[model samples]
Target chain A: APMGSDPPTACCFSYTARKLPRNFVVDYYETSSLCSQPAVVFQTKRSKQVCADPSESWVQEYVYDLELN
Target chain B: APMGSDPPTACCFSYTARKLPRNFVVDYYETSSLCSQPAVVFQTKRSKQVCADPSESWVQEYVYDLELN
Candidate 1:
């Protein structure tokens, strides 16, 4: 169940306020990584810097969903 | 050897058990540079999410290649 992998591309958090999503990528997976952690699903849209494939699915209300502590 | 600055672009690590490889832009070279250090080589598929130009080279078995102390 390796969706994208830990750190499979970084910086994603733009649902409207803390703005910073122009380079996303993280197809999800890694709920047992011992905390190198993994469970991302970024890239909703911000000019979509380049994620290809007509922007493959990613819509959790445009990712402002936090977790990384 | 200036193989893509200290941070001209980032993220790459998808070798199987820890995924996330598809947003690469490094091409190796940096055993020096005063440890602003450089030495990377990434990019593998995910529907070939484009590293650009005919999907250039980068596939040492889906890259899990690491380095970042």
Candidate 2:
């Protein structure tokens, strides 16, 4: 058995931190143009992955035709 | 404490649907090929284990026969 994905799709790549050292930095990035360019859009020296732990950081499924506002 | 990838990989399985209420139409189809006939070209969705998901959802490693279209 395999999982199926919605076609005409978009994806967002994210990183999460867990009880990191106070100096640890987590970097999150997304594909800028197709799969060729990766642009680092967000980074934090903070700790959010601890308090929320589950739904802390993410990008929901977005289609090409949706208004992202 | 293990992290290594990129030996020749093509993995793009995208789904981040959550907070569903009702009749959520998140249908994305890559193939109805039925897996009977030999598909010299195809798109496949896979679910895999994640070592670093203090977050959610992923495929950790992959390698394929050819360049994905």
Candidate 3:
């Protein structure tokens, strides 16, 4: 389900967290914006997944490396 | 642990939902303000707990009936 916007521009994405010790792998995402901003919808080995800002340098770097499957 | 504030005026409360049919019992709460506003810290039978406005009419009613135990 969409978090905020109903008719999202681009709906979802996935990524693996790197360059950090947590090594949290983001499995699903949803957002109103296609690339400007997005939220990680699902993650493995975590109680809950939080929405993250795609505009962040670290987030962008990971997103750039993401291959939509 | 405090949700947003480090030192909260009044920390916790518990309540049983009645007005609605869901019967979702709130087990814990945290807030920046003691009585002015707060968030439901825990809810049974749900995977995620969401922050709610303590000022809302329904929420106020529930808070009024809450027990600090």
Q: Ten-residue segment with the worst summed lDDT in candidate 3 chain A?
A: A2-11
Clashing pairs in 2: A6-B28, A7-B28
Candidate rank order under DockQ: 1, 2, 3
Candidate 1 lDDT tens digits, A9-62: 332211222323434433222122332322333333323232121132333333
lDDT of 1 at B20: 35
Question: Looking at every candidate separately, what fraction of the true A–B Cα contacts under 8 Å does it contain?
Answer: 0.13, 0.04, 0.00
Sort the predicted structures by TM-score, highest score first: 3, 1, 2
Q: DockQ, per-model, please?
A: 0.10, 0.05, 0.04
Tens digit of lDDT per residue, candidate 2, span B1-69? 333211111223323343221123222223112212111112232422211211232211111212232
Instruction: Give the higher-lDDT candidate: 1 or 2.
Output: 1
Tens digits of per-residue lDDT for model 2, A1-69: 555432321222332343333243253333334333232223335432221122332322221112243
User: What is residue A28's positional error in candidate 1, in angstroms?
Assistant: 8.7
- Tens-digit lDDT string for candidate 3 (B14-65): 3334333235545435543423323544343443343444555776566555
Where does model 2 sit among the CAPRI classes?
A: incorrect
Could you estimate the TM-score for every candidate?
Answer: 0.19, 0.18, 0.31
Better model by DockQ, 1 or 3? 1
**Tens-digit lDDT string for candidate 3 (A1-69):** 523211112223333343322365455344544333345443334434434545557755655555553
Q: Deviation in angstroms for B59 in model 2?
A: 22
Top candidate, metric DockQ: 1
- On the 0 to 100 scale, the lDDT of residue A31 in model 3 is 51
Each candidate: RMSD: 14.9, 17.1, 11.1
